[PDB]
């Protein structure tokens, strides 16, 4: 989790915001995915959010459902995702790496064993999309024991109890949910700081450079963008692919200076 804390220090020291893209690991293939991920970091991504293919991606809309399907068509398994994670970390020592998991993949072989593998490969955080704070105790405990930041969702209309629990339970960054529904509001940022929460990133629907500067100005530490990157992978399903995502990322990160 200490990579996130060094990144955020070196962004407001820069008076800058974070831009964090999401891709599904192994989409559209293993070797290809590693090239997209390298292009994302070179194009200026501050951190990564990486999805492990799951049979039933319940919080994901059609854009990322098909990302999972494409990865499954390539034979991508969780074990091979952790081999990819090891290679990504070995090339990029400082880039924070967050995983987007579903509960059954974390619980399958033992919760502690899962987080132990995350630590061994150099993962910095884990968001489990279908574990609310109410159910999170064994997951966040195993995460902290293995130096993994557990990431929690802060929904738009969130009560004060939820803001306090997210602030106390989370590490690395606070996921600011921007709407309801599935993949495809400034009043909470100050209260999160009041309770010493991990820095907030807004996500879940961001697709153009407009939203980033808006979030940085709202005092949010940065933004996350999911389907927009996958759609760009989607639009150009190989050489013209990589140039398409490189162009997108720089516009996003330019907007985080102000």
């Amino acid at each position: 989790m200490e990579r996130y804390e060094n990144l955020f220090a070196q962004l407001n020291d820069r008076r800058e915001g974070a831009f964090v893209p999401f891709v599904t690991l192994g989409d559209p293939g293993i070797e290809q995915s590693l090239k997209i991920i390298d292009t994302l970091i070179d194009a200026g991504a501050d951190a990564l959010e990486l999805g492990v293919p799951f049979s039933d991606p319940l919080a994901d809309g059609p854009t990322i459902q098909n990302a999972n399907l494409r990865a499954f068509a390539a034979g991508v398994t969780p074990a091979q995702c952790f081999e990819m994670l090891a290679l990504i970390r070995e090339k990029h020592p400082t880039i924070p790496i967050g995983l987007l998991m579903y509960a059954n993949l974390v619980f399958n072989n033992g919760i502690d064993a899962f987080y132990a593998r995350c630590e061994q490969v150099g993962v910095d955080s884990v968001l489990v999309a279908d574990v609310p704070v109410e159910e999170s105790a064994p997951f966040r405990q195993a995460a902290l024991r293995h130096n993994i930041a557990p990431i929690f969702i802060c929904p738009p209309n969130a009560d004060d109890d939820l803001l306090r629990q997210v602030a106390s339970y989370g590490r690395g960054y606070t996921y600011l949910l921007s709407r309801s529904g599935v993949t495809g509001l400034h009043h909470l940022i100050e209260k999160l700081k009041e309770y010493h929460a991990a820095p907030a990133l807004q996500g879940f629907g961001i697709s153009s450079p407009e939203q980033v500067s808006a979030a940085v100005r709202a005092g949010a530490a940065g933004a996350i963008s999911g389907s927009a990157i996958v759609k760009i992978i989607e639009k150009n399903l190989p050489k013209q692919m990589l140039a398409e995502l490189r162009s997108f990322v720089s516009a996003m990160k330019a907007a985080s200076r102000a």
Binding site: S55, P78, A103, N104, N108, D130, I153, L162
Partner: protein, 395 residues
């Protein structure tokens, strides 16, 4: 925090995205308030009696037990309006939705009995209803499809994933993730996140309550065992609930064996899967070694589901209830047997429960035993399925 315990031992819980927790908490609060509201209970009883037709008959089977010491009764949920036990709890949930001031209904269905039940309750009570159903399911019970839209329901085929019941389930939570603010999600079985396993049990428990009153009237004692098929768990827990504290009454749930458990083409996660987290609950699942959810298989669309409700996993764990499996061929034989010797055409789902009762009788024909089968629905919807099978054979 919650008003009610969300777990049955280690099974259950609320494994949903944070965005949906207020909806579940709202539903739990409405349910607890309704359960204490005599006016809600009066309205629910009125619909059950005067619209759905409760109490349902308890029919003693003379012919099929001849020559044995088994007495077999069938709890006739096949006589309920709509043709299955699904109708009971949609009427309660539809009232819950209205209690919350909600005006739209979301439902999932594979066999279509629950979607038809959702549509008919919504037609009667003035709710706008939309139903998710695996597109592979829309092809094979087009009858049930046309029944829902005759009743003004919007039917939405599912292309994601395997295009079947589990995929239909994920679409519903996906949609409800959109806006629970105006819609209520009418989950169709005793599974999913809390409070649904609790609500569906309580809205089905009249099956067992009536069975107990009726067996006592006709035999002067409790049954030796009550037997029910288990797709997600609603008719079985509806049968079981009122007998759980009568410790001499066996509680037997029947999972689909499909082509045979050893083939892996089956729907029996409780005895042959292992614990996982999916569909908002921690419960037995059919899953790959690395935690992907498997596809299940049953001749009967309504049992074809790779998990099971958490209260059954718990009743199994402590030994209160026993679970077995019945194959396709065995269910087909019990279907034919009931048609020919009692003049009742049972749902293939219920035929699994019947098949296991017939096995208990046939294996030990001099064992004195008083049995009840939850006959959860009628098999008019299956006669095309059964005909095509019979035609591929000889006969």
């Amino acid at each position: 925090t919650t008003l009610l315990n969300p777990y049955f031992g280690e099974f259950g819980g609320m494994y949903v995205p944070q965005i949906l927790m207020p909806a579940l908490n709202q539903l739990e609060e409405a349910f607890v308030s309704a359960q204490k509201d005599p006016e809600f209970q009066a309205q629910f009883a009125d619909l059950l009696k005067n619209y759905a037709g409760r109490p349902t008959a308890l029919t003693k089977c003379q012919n099929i037990t001849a020559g044995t010491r088994t007495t077999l009764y069938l709890k006739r949920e096949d006589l309920l309006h709509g043709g299955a036990h699904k109708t009971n709890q949609v009427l309660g949930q539809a009232l819950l939705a209205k209690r919350m001031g909600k005006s739209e209904i979301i439902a999932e269905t594979g066999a279509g009995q629950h979607g038809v039940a959702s549509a008919l309750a919504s037609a009667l009570l003035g709710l706008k209803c939309r139903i998710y159903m695996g597109a592979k399911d829309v092809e094979r019970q087009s009858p049930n499809v046309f029944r829902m839209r005759l009743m003004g329901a919007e039917v939405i085929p599912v292309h994601s994933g395997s295009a079947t019941l589990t995929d239909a389930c994920n679409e519903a939570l996906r949609d409800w993730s959109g806006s629970y603010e105006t819609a209520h999600y009418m989950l169709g079985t005793a599974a999913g996140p809390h409070p649904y396993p609790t609500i569906v049990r309580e809205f089905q428990r009249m099956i067992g309550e009536e069975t107990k009153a009726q067996i006592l009237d006709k035999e002067g004692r409790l049954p030796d065992a009550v037997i029910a098929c288990v797709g997600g768990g609603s008719n079985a827990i509806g049968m079981f609930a009122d007998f759980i504290n009568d410790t001499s009454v066996g509680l037997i749930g029947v999972e689909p064996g499909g082509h045979g458990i050893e083939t892996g083409e089956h729907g029996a996660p409780l005895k042959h899967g292992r614990v996982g987290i999916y569909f908002g609950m921690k419960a037995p699942m059919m899953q790959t070694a690395d935690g992907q959810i498997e596809e299940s298989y049953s001749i009967s669309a309504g049992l074809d589901f790779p998990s099971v409700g958490p209260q059954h996993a718990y009743l199994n764990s402590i030994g209160r209830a026993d679970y077995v499996s019945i194959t396709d061929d065995e269910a087909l034989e019990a279907f034919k047997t009931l048609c020919r010797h009692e003049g009742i055409i049972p749902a293939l789902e219920s035929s699994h429960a019947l098949a296991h009762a017939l096995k208990m009788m046939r294996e030990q024909p001099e064992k004195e035993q008083l049995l009840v089968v939850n006959l959860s629905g009628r098999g008019d919807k299956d006669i095309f399925t059964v005909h095509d099978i019979l035609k591929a054979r000889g006969e």
